[PDB]
Every structure is written in structure tokens, then in C-alpha cells.
């Protein structure tokens, strides 16, 4: 006999949805029945997602590949509570439920691609991984010719896991304690791998390999290739001795930049900051000679200074911080700023100014 199983819709649905997230067989899921378990695997040849579903009902071992989006859409479209029977009939997979029948094309399991050497392993809460990624994801490059910038650095150091992302105009770094003594390792996860890892974080075990990373979450296993290349060292990017410290409420500062942005140049998005004793003035103008001005009370006792920024990059940081008060650490008008939560040093943001 060939592969056969019967499974409740609600046992199949979420696993199918997650693995279903080019070439014909790469649009298929590998389905394998073995030892009381249905395994479902999806891949794009660089990363892979595997789900395991316990089989409560009688089944027969075997394997096939079947179109992933069609099979998911069929199962989702069946009524709540439906039992779904699957068997193989020649070159098709027959799906039956109630008086519904679906015959899907298959390709042989033996033709489905398969990937491994592990080097560091640790466990951490899903919320911690999510914080690390959300703190830095927005600063990754998009289609930069420097391929290693299109992803995210994951680094272990001491008892901490760290993420770094940069596109050359801004950088984000976030570190969190893991409570385990870790070897030093730093790998680049491609953008699409970062996105897939986030989709799973609904503890987590991570294995970092030579050329791949693997995440175990519940009954799922995700694997991604790593990016070659030398990622920038964030320690060299942080401003060395930023002597001028401004503190402001995060909501009020963000709201002010967001209003000023309305009258900034649509292409270049430049705003001007004038810092003076306990005061920040933000101005914007555009080619139509329209002008915005915002004045805010802040905590600041340094020299007066004027510095320009792409307001989108500033708003991106303030939206990622989600805190009560922010600290901006300045040096001069042609040097980057460091921005951080006034109450936490777990994340830091570096933004290059524009020339005025």
C-alpha cells in the first residue's frame, strides 16, 4: 500500500499554513507518513520549514509531494470539524471529506530536495528572539549590492545574543541576556530567513551551523542558509565620545517629527534640528517654499547646534523604541547621532546626518 492518512482539519490547518509560507516541485509540500507522524516540508532551496503532526487515526507509511497552496486552500475551505482523508492514486493525491473530492497532481518524494553541521546551540524565550529581531529589522538593507547587508547579523558573545542591521545610512543593534555561557559566533541571516523566523514566534531552540541556522519551535523546524561576507563591526560605527546629550519624551518627539515631515522634500525628507538650552526646534521646508516649525521642551545643557536628518530614518528609530523617554547623543553636524531609550541600553541606534 501507499501513503494514507486521515486527520482532523483543525490538527492540519495551522501546520499547513506555516509550511506553505519558481520550479514546480518547489511549489509542493513533501508529505511523509512514518511512525505515527505526518511530516510536511516546504522549501525554496535555501530555507526549509518542517511541521510534524501526530496521527491519531490509522495510517499507512509513505510519501509524496503535492501543490502546497492548493492543498492548504482545500483544507481551509472545508467546514469546521471536517475529517480529511488522503491517499495516493497513480500520479494524483486524492483528498476526501464528506461528499467533497479533490485529485491533486503529485511529483515523487524522491525528487524533493534535502539539505548540516552544528556549532552552537542555545534556548531562549520566543519573546526574547522577537524583541531582538523587531529592534533591528527595519535597518536592514533592501537589495543593496553589498549582499551581506540585506540580512541581519546574529552574534553570540558572553551570555548575550545580539542582532545588528545596517543599510549604510542607519544602524540598529540590540543585545539580550540568555543566561547561558555561549561561544563567540556571528552569522548573517538573509532577510527572507529573518521574516520566516518571525512567522514562527507565535521556548525556542537555536542551532547555528557552519553555513546554516536552525530554529526549533514547538512541532516546527526552520532552517536557513547563511549569507557569506564580512558584516560591519557595530563597535566601530558607534560614535566615539558623543558629548552633547538631549533627553525628550518619545511620544512628543515622534509626534513633532511626524508633523514636520509633512512639509519636507518628498525625495530627500530632510528636517533641521536646532538644539539650545532645554529646547529643540525642528524645521522642514520643501521646493514649494512651504515651512513647518515645531518647538519642544527637552533636557539639554550643551552648546547650541544645528543638524540635519532624513526624518524617515529618525521616525523609524522612535517607532522601534516604544519607550517613555529617548536620549540623543550628539557630537557635531557632520557626525552620526546615537539614539537610545533613556531607561535601557539593550538597544542602540546610529543615524548619519544630512548636510545642511
Amino acid at each position: 500500500g501507499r501513503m494514507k492518512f486521515t486527520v482532523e482539519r483543525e490538527h492540519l490547518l495551522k501546520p499547513l499554513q506555516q509550511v506553505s509560507g519558481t520550479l514546480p516541485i518547489l511549489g509542493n509540500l513533501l508529505l511523509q507518513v512514518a511512525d505515527g507522524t505526518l511530516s510536511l516540508t516546504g522549501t525554496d532551496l535555501e530555507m526549509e520549514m518542517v511541521a510534524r503532526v501526530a496521527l491519531v487515526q490509522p495510517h499507512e507509511p509513505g510519501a509524496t509531494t503535492v501543490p502546497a497552496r492548493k492543498f492548504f486552500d482545500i483544507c481551509r475551505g472545508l467546514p469546521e470539524g471536517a475529517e480529511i482523508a488522503v491517499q495516493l492514486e497513480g500520479e494524483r493525491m486524492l483528498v476526501r471529506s464528506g461528499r467533497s473530492r479533490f485529485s491533486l497532481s503529485t511529483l515523487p518524494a524522491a525528487d524533493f530536495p534535502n539539505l548540516w553541521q552544528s556549532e552552537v546551540e542555545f534556548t531562549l524565550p520566543q519573546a526574547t528572539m522577537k524583541r531582538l529581531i523587531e529592534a533591528t529589522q527595519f535597518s536592514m538593507a533592501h537589495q543593496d549590492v553589498r549582499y551581506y547587508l540585506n540580512g541581519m547579523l546574529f552574534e553570540t558573545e558572553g551570555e548575550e545574543l545580539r542582532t545588528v542591521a545596517t543599510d549604510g545610512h542607519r544602524l540598529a543593534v540590540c543585545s539580550m541576556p540568555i543566561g547561558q555561557s555561549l561561544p563567540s559566533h556571528s552569522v548573517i541571516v538573509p532577510r527572507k530567513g529573518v521574516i520566516e523566523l518571525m512567522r514562527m514566534l507565535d521556548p525556542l531552540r537555536v542551532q547555528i551551523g557552519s553555513n546554516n541556522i536552525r530554529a526549533h519551535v514547538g512541532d516546527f523546524i526552520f532552517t536557513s542558509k547563511l549569507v557569506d561576507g564580512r558584516f560591519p563591526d557595530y563597535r566601530r560605527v558607534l560614535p566615539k565620545n558623543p558629548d552633547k546629550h538631549l533627553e525628550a519624551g518619545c511620544d512628543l518627539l515622534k509626534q513633532a517629527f511626524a508633523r514636520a515631515a509633512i512639509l519636507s522634500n518628498e525625495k530627500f525628507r530632510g528636517v533641521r534640528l536646532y538644539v539650545s538650552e532645554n529646547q529643540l526646534k525642528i524645521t522642514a521646508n520643501n521646493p514649494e517654499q512651504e515651512e513647518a516649525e515645531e518647538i519642544l521642551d527637552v533636557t539639554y545643557s550643551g552648546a547650541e547646534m544645528e543638524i540635519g536628518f532624513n526624518v524617515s530614518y529618525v521616525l523609524d528609530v522612535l517607532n522601534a523604541l516604544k519607550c517613555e523617554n529617548v536620549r540623543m547623543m550628539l557630537t557635531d553636524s557632520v557626525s552620526s547621532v546615537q539614539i537610545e531609550d533613556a531607561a535601557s541600553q539593550s538597544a542602540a541606534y546610529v543615524v548619519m546626518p544630512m548636510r545642511l
Binding site: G168, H169, R236, S336, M352
Partner: peptide, 10 residues
Amino acid sequence: VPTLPLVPXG
């Protein structure tokens, strides 16, 4: 539009 001091590319 200066860049951060990334090596290479700034």
C-alpha cells in the same frame, strides 16, 4: 548624503 563609516562603502 554622507554614509556611516562602513568598510567598505561608507
